[PDB]
Amino acid sequence: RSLKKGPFIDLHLLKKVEKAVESGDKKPLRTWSRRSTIFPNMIGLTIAVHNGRQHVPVFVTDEMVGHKLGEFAPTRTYR
Amino acid sequence: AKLHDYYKDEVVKKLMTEFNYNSVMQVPRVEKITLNMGVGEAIADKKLLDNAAADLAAISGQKPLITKARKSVAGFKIRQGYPIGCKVTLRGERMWEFFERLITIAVPRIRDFRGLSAKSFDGRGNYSMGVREQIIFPEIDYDKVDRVRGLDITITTTAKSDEEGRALLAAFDFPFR
Amino acid sequence: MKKDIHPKYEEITASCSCGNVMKIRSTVGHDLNLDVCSKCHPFFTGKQRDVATGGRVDRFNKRFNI
Amino acid sequence: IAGINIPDHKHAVIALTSIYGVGKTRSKAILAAAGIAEDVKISELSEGQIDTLRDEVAKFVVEGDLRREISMSIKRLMDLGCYRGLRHRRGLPVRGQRTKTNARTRKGPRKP
RNA sequence: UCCUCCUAAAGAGUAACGGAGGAGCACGAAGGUUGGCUAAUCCUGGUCGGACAUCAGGAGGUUAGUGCAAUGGCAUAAGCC
RNA sequence: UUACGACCAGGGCUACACACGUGCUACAAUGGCGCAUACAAAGAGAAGCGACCUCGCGAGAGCAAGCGGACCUCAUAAAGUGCGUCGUAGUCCGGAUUGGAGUCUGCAACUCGACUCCAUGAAGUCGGAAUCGCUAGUAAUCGUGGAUCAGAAUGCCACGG
RNA sequence: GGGUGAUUAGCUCAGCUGGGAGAGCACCUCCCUAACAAGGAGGGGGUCGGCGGUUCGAUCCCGUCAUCACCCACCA
Ligand SMILES: [Mg+2]
Ligand SMILES: [Mg+2]
Ligand SMILES: [Mg+2]
Ligand SMILES: [Mg+2]
Ligand SMILES: [Mg+2]
């Protein structure tokens, strides 16, 4: 569904995560990279992701590692 | 019996030292088993209660006493005296025979069985259990049954505490959790 | 007991596919041959297998063949 | 007759498909691994072979384990807060189909 | 016309277009005896089964029940088999 | 006309109590599923079609000829026939919907791709009033191709049985 | 002041000393129609006035109050 080899992540979002574990837990990371998957070294972070109009924050949990950030940010609001 | 002397040796020797009892009359013993099955749906027709009584008598070597509703409840749409369940009391030799032939070849046959609750004691040392499926006893041949009418066991013992009931019942290798 | 209102009781000897054969008194009428008895059902080894869940970064780590 | 539940009256390949978790090819693989003829029925099988069938089925997640496994999957997604989980909660299609006119299966029988 | 309570003033009785309710039957068992038995309600554990069904043990002690009003009575049960 | 013009990222055009139009697949035995085998036409291809072979249960991946094509590839046509089974059951009909495992293309498949494998097996047992097409290689049915297109037809445009 | 009756779908009304609770037209969708009407197919509705009560059941049975509809208030 993604590829045989080489899981995908945007470079800018990878760099912000490495800077996070270097500087520890910090303020939420505001990113628009709804396509980049989750790595284990993002767990414990409260990164915020775009939903088209606002950055909805998502607190990364152990389970959410095989998914993508946009999977936890709905786009269209209904009722 | 098969398990009576087993108990009278191993469990008595264990519980004489476990609780520093001064007499063999003090170590708790199991006194009866009550196999209950409240059919509930026999208000529709008596055939269900007769079938359930047949299954209960097959499971335990005794005719089941038919229990009728004690008081009328409008919620359940029954009135006083409606035959509504079947019940068997097992004591002594039949008690021990059923106990062994349960804890040997009926609990293992429970679908997705991983252990019976150990905290399910009423506070007076007596234990209770539900089976949800009568076919778990070997006596049901699948060629004369109609439904999966569940069943209830109540092991009534003379223990005066949940710790005492658990201690008595574990020595028989009770598949707890 | 109540003198022939109760079903028959015979000392049958029920057998199992993995040994586990014993002399029992029951109202069956034929020695049914069943699967594992209490002596072989995995509630002594299967306790390790009872906790069958665990490891999601493991799944992530195995997919990382790159 | 065993395999947790009862397979009845059918060819061993297709009777075994009644096992929740065994379909056409898994049943073919089981009968291949048990050395049982495909074309024969469940009433012509010896008790000395059904035990092998129980062994063969034991190498697969089946009714009790499978339905728990599926329930864990859906609940883990529902509790996850992800889009697939949200669609599971609200009852809407998850694979990404239309909801404008179709999706009567997931939505259920029509109601105004 | 009849029954129950109050008015009715601790024996009986006691009126009003005084205050409240019922009856004009039922039952060959719901009568007679001889055995046996003891409720309502709540708590705990128990398969569908819950506020409440049947089960087990604990409290409780007649708050239950009586063919039908109300009063009086009923464990030696007059209650249930 | 320092924005109704311009650039970028994300989102939306894919929503979903419902209603309608046009379709595809079925509700089976004039059939489903296995094994064997026959007969097309038309068309497209150079950052393209991609033999053979090897590895994959498969989608395919590696190596790699040939072909600007009556030469090579896409490309074994399918309904058909022969044999066997299934014996009228919501089934060996139906193939939805969900859960895993994956392949590809693409910078990137979460919103929101296609495809393969394992598991699941939902409605549906021929359709109310009404209503549509068709006069002969026509209706009905069966498969194939092309345009658009990195990927994405149950639509469209073509071809033959 | 005294007496009687009625209360059931949005409207007008039927409803067994018990039994989802029914009819017309209203409402919903779909047909028909250029489009509406009319016509045809399918469908949904309910405080049975409200706490109450002998009951295997209270809609119809059971005192009552709430409201609207009547009737009587004569000799005086
Ligand atoms: Mg007496
Ligand atoms: Mg953009
Ligand atoms: Mg099929
Ligand atoms: Mg499949
Ligand atoms: Mg028709």
Task: Set down the secondary structure blueprint.
This is part of a larger assembly, with chains A (79 residues), B (177 residues), C (66 residues) and D (112 residues).
Chain A: H1 11-23, E1 30-31, E2 48-50, E3 55-57
Parallel strand pairs in A: 1-2
Antiparallel strand pairs in A: 2-3
Chain B: H1 4-18, E1 30-38, H2 46-59, E2 65-68, E3 83-90, H3 92-105, E4 127-130, E5 152-157, H4 162-170
Antiparallel strand pairs in B: 1-3, 1-5, 2-3, 4-5
Chain C: E1 10-16, E2 19-26, E3 33-34, H1 46-50, H2 57-63
Parallel strand pairs in C: 1-3
Antiparallel strand pairs in C: 1-2
The complex binds magnesium ion (5 copies).
Chain B binds three RNA strands through residues 32, 34-40, 43, 67-79, 82, 84-87, 117, 119-134, 148-156.
Q: What would you say this structure looks like, in words?
A:
- In chain B, 29% of the residues lie in helices and 18% in strands.
- Chain B has helices spanning 4-18, 46-59, 92-105, 162-170; strands at 30-38, 65-68, 83-90, 127-130, 152-157.
- Chain B is globular.
- Chain C has 66 residues and is α+β, with helices and mostly antiparallel strands.
- Chain C has a three-stranded mixed beta sheet, with no helix packed on it.
- With 112 residues, chain D is mainly alpha-helical.
- In chain D, 50% of the residues lie in helices and 0% in strands.
- Chains in contact: A-C, A-D, B-C, B-D, C-D.
- Chains B and C meet through α3 of B and β2 of C.
- Chain B binds three RNA strands through residues 32, 34-40, 43, 67-79, 82, 84-87, 117, 119-134, 148-156.
- It is classed as ribosome.
- The entry lists the keywords abcf, ATPase, translation.
- The entry is titled "E. coli pre-elongation complex without an A-site tRNA with EQ2-EttA in Hydrolytic 1 conformation".
